Amino acid sequence: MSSGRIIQIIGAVIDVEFERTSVPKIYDALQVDGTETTLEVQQQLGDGVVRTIAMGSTEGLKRGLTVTSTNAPISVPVGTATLGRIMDVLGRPIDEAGPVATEERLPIHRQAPSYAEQAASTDLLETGIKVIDLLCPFAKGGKVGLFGGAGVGKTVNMMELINNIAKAHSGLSVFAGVGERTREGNDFYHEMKDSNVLDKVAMVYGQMNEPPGNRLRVALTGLTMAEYFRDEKDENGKGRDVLLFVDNIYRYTLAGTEVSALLGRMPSAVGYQPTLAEEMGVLQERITSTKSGSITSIQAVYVPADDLTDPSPATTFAHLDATVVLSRDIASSGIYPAIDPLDSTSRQLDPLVVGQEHYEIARAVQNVLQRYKELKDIIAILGMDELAEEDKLVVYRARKIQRFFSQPFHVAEVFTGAPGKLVPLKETIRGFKGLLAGEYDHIPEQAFYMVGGIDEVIAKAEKL
Amino acid sequence: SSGRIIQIIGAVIDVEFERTSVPKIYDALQVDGTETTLEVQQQLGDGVVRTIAMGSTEGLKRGLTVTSTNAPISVPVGTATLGRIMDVLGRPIDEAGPVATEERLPIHRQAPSYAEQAASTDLLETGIKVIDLLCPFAKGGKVGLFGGAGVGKTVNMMELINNIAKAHSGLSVFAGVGERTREGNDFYHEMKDSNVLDKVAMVYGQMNEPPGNRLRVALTGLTMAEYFRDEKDENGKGRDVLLFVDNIYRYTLAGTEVSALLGRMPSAVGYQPTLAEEMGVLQERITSTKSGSITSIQAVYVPADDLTDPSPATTFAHLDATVVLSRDIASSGIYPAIDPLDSTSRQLDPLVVGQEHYEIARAVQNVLQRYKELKDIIAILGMDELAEEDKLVVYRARKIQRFFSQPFHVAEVFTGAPGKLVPLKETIRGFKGLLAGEYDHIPEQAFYMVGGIDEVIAKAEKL
Amino acid sequence: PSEISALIKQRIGDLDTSATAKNEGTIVMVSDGIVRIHGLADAMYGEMIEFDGGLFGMALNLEQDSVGAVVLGNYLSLQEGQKARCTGRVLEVPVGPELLGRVVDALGNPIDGKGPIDAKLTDAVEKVAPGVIWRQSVDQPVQTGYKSVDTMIPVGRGQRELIIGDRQTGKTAMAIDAIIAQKNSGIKCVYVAIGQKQSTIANVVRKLEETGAMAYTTVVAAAAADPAAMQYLAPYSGCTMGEYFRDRGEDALIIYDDLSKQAVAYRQISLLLRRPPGREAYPGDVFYLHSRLLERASRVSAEYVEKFTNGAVTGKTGSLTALPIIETQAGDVSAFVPTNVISITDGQIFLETSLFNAGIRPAVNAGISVSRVGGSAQTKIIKKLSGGIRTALAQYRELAAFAQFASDLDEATRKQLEHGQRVTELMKQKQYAPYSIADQAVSVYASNEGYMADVEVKKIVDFDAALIAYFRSEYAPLMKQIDETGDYNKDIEAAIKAGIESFKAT
Amino acid sequence: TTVVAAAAADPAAMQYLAPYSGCTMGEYFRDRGEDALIIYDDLSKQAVAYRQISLLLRRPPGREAYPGDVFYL
């Protein structure tokens, strides 16, 4: 018969026996016959008995209660209507916007793309954030870890990213909240709501309070979302590219460690799920650019124990295509975005990749900034007077670079009425290389604050 | 009578036996299909016991038949085993025909009695400054090369074999234990270039071999040497026995490999609990007795370069002659890289070494000790902000370090500079002259990678 | 059209012509591609295992009443009770020269999607090392297209030499260059991808076919997402394919990439078998587990070739050279697995983080990087010109180290420092910049002749390149002659210094 | 105000369970549309006791003998 009954449960573990003729395969959906609790097939304990974890609470439930199968893994709806809705792990409405209209659903646990499906080329992913555009340029199917503390508009940063991707290239965006600090999630919802960006992104949060399994699986949930969206192709083929932001995959690792303990198998060397690398690859290699269409992913990450030798960041670095860090003092200097420009690094920093001239200009700029940091200490301890003249020029020009980095945003535009800044590559570089000639030493550093292109800078200098 | 295979895990086997016939704990068990052989280890009882295999574990199924020899592993023994290359079974690998003699000897035996030990009181001059200075030897003692991976455990042995071999005349044996095949073959050909090739015998149990083979590999050669020491010359006794161990750590490692499969427990790190007793059993059958003299050299790999590991710790309880290598000294390019301090010798006796030897050595170690101590502050502070005598001692010790740096006769392979053999008298006089400060005006470069003090004079005046 | 019809008809008239006697065992327990099967007694340890799903298995545990085994691929379509048969035959893999220009499954199945390829020979994967009486001393060079590498750290045919460094510090690019060097040599070269990103994979590929190297070349891949079994097993298979030509008296070359992943994957798998671990979760055999594979590469005797091919050859000594890869955490050379592997290799190379951070590409920590063989493969020119220069610069490193907290420097220290600076700048090259022998030959000549301690610090490399141009233009027959031979004559160096003066005049 | 006590001499179970109770009583007045505040004391010893129980419950050991469910809790 197509259902079984509860035979034993401990902790988060559930056991049910079946007949030998009907027993599901792994990951298939199992609904508790009598409540809304759902069970995920994990491994076959034999004797008609199989082990599963329930999605949701563990009470209200006692042995002998029947539980059925769907003989299929978790299938959650996919469609354009998914935008603007916040859903549970099971893709069930939690914004109280009614049930999702789209009944077109797809399975989750699915195979990574083929070798043939590996996009045969690599090319620079673009955006409007000059420091991103130059100091850490991205590529489609990109994976960058984010670093920093709290109080810098990380959310705001993402908002501008989504606005730009939906504007320039109509690239879609989805977010997954893993271990969300519920209040912060609500606040972020309101924030993305006042901004009309709400309509352009799909929302599911895994609140840390939940049973660790669903918290684990929300990742693949949003992953499948993005897969469908990119594979959702307009005319002429070549569907749009999609963007994914993942909330602190470190929390995901923690949940994996939890559930690893839950099965009651071996805790690893430092103590982790030993299979962590495999599920890493499950995540990563399922995300890239395709032969037609791409999905790029930007992921929050916290470093436990502030160490770079514990396993989690080590495994993480196997996939971080670039490094982006946020510095507190930079925000304290009113510089926005408050990204530390000098130390965030991109693997995609080769003249082979970024372009020869582009590479040279970037190298020179970072050299200048490095020099300036070597200088400002001697300045403060000895006054700006005691420097060589070229040293002073470097000081002023680098500070001009920092000011030029300061820019308003279209997200800031609604926040405080002021036209946002949109700037591509080869638009920044012209002004930068001109600055390398020192042709703006007459131009005050103030003429670079909260400004877009170098033409706008010179216009400001005119009005100033 | 015969047995049948019932389970296969890794490299450990179990077999069913008739209630009438249960072979003793140590016997050869022939695979009735192949050449594969088995040794018993555990009496699992109820007509079933546990064993390991020697050779490949493949081509083996369950229920297959195996006989017993009713005889433990007893291998061919005698001088007809010299100049030959044997397996772990003591069978030719050189393909120079089967061995001639018919005498066999079991690999297992109890240790010799207390009433049989000997006073190894015979020194040795080698030609390596640090060794003959710091570690006087007893002809018949145990010589271990404590060192990490790639510190020069093999090199230090090759050069000694050169020097030792040429300075000696008589029996000698080598047994490759779990090492790179290339180095072993190269050594074999080098020995073939020599002629004591005849005087010696070869056997290689190498890393490629299965761990069952890897375990009882030393037993062969050690038993060989024990015989030859007990093999008395007519109107005389046994001869001077040259023994050379190659990473007994490999044997320890195999014991670790097997213990869990043996139904055994995991030591404080994971070793077999029985590691100490088996190491002692191994070592005790190694001694120069009232009969004959046995001289043993031990290759001592050090896991992760750690001393506090249980195995080295146990090892010191076994080695009268202790020689230790360092990674940082090699990081300084000093070849060899033996640490002066920890490598010690119980032969270091003023009534034995002569007063001047003793006191000069002690003063040297004292100087090095202060230098190492002050290393911290000199790293922190400026070298100039120190007392003058302190700085003098610093330069003294550095020049001492350099004066230890010596080219070796086989070391010219990676350098080209001709190796040296420095008589102990030159060493003593040169070190005393340094400690006298007769050379404080001499550039430190004049002492690097040299031999005797006269070489130092030539280098300095050249410079 | 109809040709496929005739082919399929005759392939159908070919086989399945009769029933077959066989033995089955059904599933008992499953977890993570690790399964418990009961009912097969005729089984072989690690044999191929038949399954209705079309996949296969390798046998692990021969207990009294069942077997545990390992999947080869994913297993989500598997469940207890299904049918599971035995091949009665050991693990194998197709091997042949046909593999050239192809990248396939870790079980030799074309992932390129360029048609399946038959290999008239197939060989078991797990094999043992040859006999000592068949080994041959390394005597033949291998060129790396480098100055720093080829000179200070010689590597000959058949040597094993680990490469160790950090992330994005230049670990592979080096091996790649070495392979490209072998283009003209025509030696056998083959590389294995082991648990890395397919993006990186296709990058390597596209580079290779750009070079056109992927015609005397074969590569197989273990994807980072593939279930750990293939990661564990693949390097053995790659060694198996490589040994084919060494088994034919033909020198061979293998490149192992990131054995660390394979090591940890095996650790995990074996631990899932609940076996007790040693230090940092690694079991003991891991040392053996890798080393046994490593020993399979060596330079062997033509006599061994004859013993292998029993008349099928005239007898030439074969070899296989090994390129393993292990990464170091925070530059911990003393790390456990590194300590294990260094005890195995015939030598090692380590790359310094800061110099690559300082832009030095490559960035050698020559301080600890040596070969057991050393000067048994270099050309007499190279071998005589080298010999202590690596030691000299190593001591220059420590001199500079000591020369920062002391204000006194004698003329010996002064000269050592100043010449170390020049030679340091002398050891630079570009990515994909190979060298002919005369290149580094004249460079080191100039260095030893002090012809560099005289010219501008920065202009060193410019002088070098312009010198190469100067000579290979004017002296092209000269360098052609010298590099075609590898032998030095004094009149040759007379011509060299004549060119030295002429170019210094320019 | 009110206080609930889990003395050190008490059996570990009640100590383990009390904080949730006090939470429930607080939520009462949260559910009463008003506001109040709660203080949580010695959660470390609470975890200690819970670990001991789990051990006596034959539950699989965790890092520092802590099954991961503690963070969940």
Add this chain to the structure above:
Amino acid sequence: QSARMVAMKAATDNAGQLIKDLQLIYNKLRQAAITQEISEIVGGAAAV
């Protein structure tokens, strides 16, 4: 005065490099210890 500043700057540099040394030492030692007690726990649990 100048030379005192130089010497004290050098002292600062020495302290910084040692500081890096100590973070690395602490990290490895902590990892090793943690793994060690984990080994003890897993050994103990296997008993009963």
